[model samples]
Target: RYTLNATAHLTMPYVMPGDGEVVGVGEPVAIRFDENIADRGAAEKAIKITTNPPVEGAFYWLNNREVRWRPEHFWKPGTAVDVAVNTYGVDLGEGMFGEDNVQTHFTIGDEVIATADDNTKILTVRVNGEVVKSMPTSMGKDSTPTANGIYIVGSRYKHIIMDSSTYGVPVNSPNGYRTDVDWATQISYSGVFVHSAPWSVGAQGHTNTSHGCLNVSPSNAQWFYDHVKRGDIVEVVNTVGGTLPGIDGLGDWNIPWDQWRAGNAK
Candidate 1:
């Protein structure tokens, strides 16, 4: 195929996903492209990748065009990776041009510690066995459920835009789904989150009726979001509905606790 030279148009502005910058050597790096160019190969070229110690890595397209990168082998300790997304004058095929060049450097810090079980409904957030916060949460409704397994806190967000589509619900009159929920304190990317559930205040601890999120009060969500860091350990277990399937953006909750541990061997 011949390379086409077309005038570049600014697509969606690039935005780094998740909270915090410290990541484990083996953790996956997620990058969300602007909606306009999500489905184009230009989105791939727009992202330039180089890593120290040069590990074999590949970018996987998650959705209509969300992309994340992970090394075939986890990152080596003290290694650094530089990502330069140059969209300055690149052609996005259908007359689309990259918005701007995004340059960032990240370093692999340390090994991550995680845990989970099938005997408790709560997922403990801890660092080196020192509990930071024990949040009261609700897990899965009867039908659509939360996975019970060892999950790494893959991504964190300060202000997430929530929509009914995330939970497989349509935004209709009867459903009355609102998309303005404040997710300033989110720990996992799975539908499951330790977020402010002002709408469910009546069932904070008295009941469990969320779609699959680990619901917490607004105050508690803020507290957890402020203290918890990325690559932290999140364990979900003991559900009558068996384990939930882990999707693309969902963390490691899909794998059984035993298998999850086995897969991390270097």
Candidate 2:
């Protein structure tokens, strides 16, 4: 039999925390593909992280084109993180495959954790083991309770509009609101944020009155916006609310370490 062989086209994946780089503890070990990966199960299994302390973690697919791995809890200070992506020849369906195998390593830096207690109406920011700041805060009202879990901070917008519609609530609904907010720090994918609500100042330290965010004075919010960096943790507690799920922003830490580790597809 006579046959013609054709070369298969392949695409590569980009792994963050390039080999031997020092990054913040909030850093998410991420991988982005030049092509959509059809066999995410195969990709997730091949992409791995081996740490010196053997921390409990999981690989979470943010989307078909991107996935990230993070510890169920924040990485320990000074810990080492290594990532390996082996996709070459690996089936991604449609006759496509990973173009190359990649490897990278990074070191975790100091822990930056912010704890917000709804019951006490206060927020405490800490670095390493030292308390950096403690200020009065107002969280989501009982009607819209702030999520009680660990969330990795995303971005800091000096100013932005807080729209209920973003979370599926209609602007005309009783539970809806739309207004300009200052120092908005995104903490979750569900539109939860930590921002300044000048109108809530009188209630900031005493009652929960905002839609589903941590509310502080303008000055305090500005301070937080300046101090926080992407990937830092925002832990909300003492609220009568549901815990953040793994897919909610970078809230993987919200899951129990054992439970997260048990689902290891790898």
Candidate 3:
């Protein structure tokens, strides 16, 4: 016969996922844990997020493995975000351990309207329904072309450096040119923008030969930078790409008007 001894031992403290750097107001940021923890409640309690202007934000668990945070009504344009993760000495109920605190910062810039279509291969820049400038654009090459739909300007940068690394082209090579532009408005992650392309000055109004960014003159980009505001609309249609999907962070442009309204929890 054998006798069993019961004893309680303290396990390693629980650790939360690493915090992501602050991002633009409307930009979607993802946070993921290196390993799954059994105690979700403790992990959630340790995570904290703070944003300027006090927008209504929520965190959604993307499964047992990942979680994402976003505002209820999508972040207002030109807003700033601050995030903190304090996972020190938390009991995860297993043999896992938690790390120290983490923090990040990010800023949002001005707003712009970007609309695209297939027949013209041009994106129309407008302010309050008035056409401001028309710039020649290059759509998706062959495999990952731009989709046809309405998308809002998600992020804006005053000066962004362009490179050929995306399309397998060497930098400073004939096919690649790296230059700093005054404004680079990101409307989609798949290489779409209402930005400046000085190298294609000759093709501004006549041809479409870009990698996907809307090629606009310096003067025109300045105009957009001065006029548009965050949360403004950018419509893209009549292209080979399909309708926009309801991505978590971009903006309302990806979702249909009716469906978007339905998504409201209130």
Candidate 4:
């Protein structure tokens, strides 16, 4: 028998949402390569997301091994997305070659969107563009105002401790305060969350409070925690500060589709 060689075949990680899976319209396409590609640009070109009725979109290199693609606008409810990963034997430079071809089809479920207004201090939830619920919310203070922009709901938990040090500031620093927060839903990696703030009840729907986090009552917080999903959209309007940074969390939604595609490095 002949000696075996590692380069005999190429292998790459599969696309997310799995084949024959159904996911929310707001879910993003996350593809990861098993090996670090030698030619990332070629790798990016090989992948494609085909949608029925046509939609504008683009691929973004999140890192060396991973790439993501999303629509310029929210996906059409009940639409199906066919993901093509036909990169087998494709040269990736430095001897790295694509391993196999893959295909996945995932359907987009109902539409979910949440809009938060800094001016009204209210958070509204909608499904398929229909209003569902409106809850009073307290946004960031004037000194450290909440960011205004479109954001996607990323991570969440029933309970977690909010601390400034998580972002590199000392816990005991002047702007730092640590505490166990309830029904916390992370809005950004920038230490922002929409969580239960009992101490801010008086300020809810009235005044700004917390360290730029959206504060809500226990009941309201629980509602959000239970309903919000990984890809849900959140739009913050009428804030006193700049829009959320594009590199933070899922703030990619804040960037216009044309601008987003233009920002692609490769």
Best by TM-score: 4
Show where candidate 4 strays beyond 4 Å.
1-14, 18-23, 33-38, 87-89, 98-103, 263-265
Candidate 3 lDDT, 1-266, residue by residue in tens? 12111111222222121232222234433445666666766765666667677776555554454445556554665576655556555665476645444454554544445566667766686543467777666555434445666555556788887666665767767556565677887665545667766777676655556555666777766666655554455676665656655553343345544453343322
Reference-based lDDT, each prediction: 0.55, 0.79, 0.55, 0.77
**RMSD in angstroms, all models?**
7.6, 6.1, 10.5, 5.1
Each prediction's total of clashing residue pairs, residues at least 3 apart in sequence or on different chains, is 4, 0, 4, 3
Candidate 4, residue 202: lDDT? 89
lDDT per residue (tens digit) for residues 13-120 in model 1? 343422225665445565555654533455665677787788766655445445656665446667777666666657765666765566656676654433333244
Q: Is candidate 1 or candidate 4 better by TM-score?
A: 4
- Candidate 4 lDDT for residue 163: 75
lDDT score of residue 213 within candidate 4: 87
Candidate 3 global TM-score:
0.51
Q: Lowest summed lDDT over 10 consecutive residues: which window, candidate 1? A: 1-10
lDDT of 2 by residue, 186-241 (tens): 98989888898889889988999877889988898999898887667888998988
Cα error, residue 174 of model 3, in Å, equals 11
lDDT of 4 at 193: 84
Clashing pairs in 3: 14-98, 15-98, 147-241, 148-241
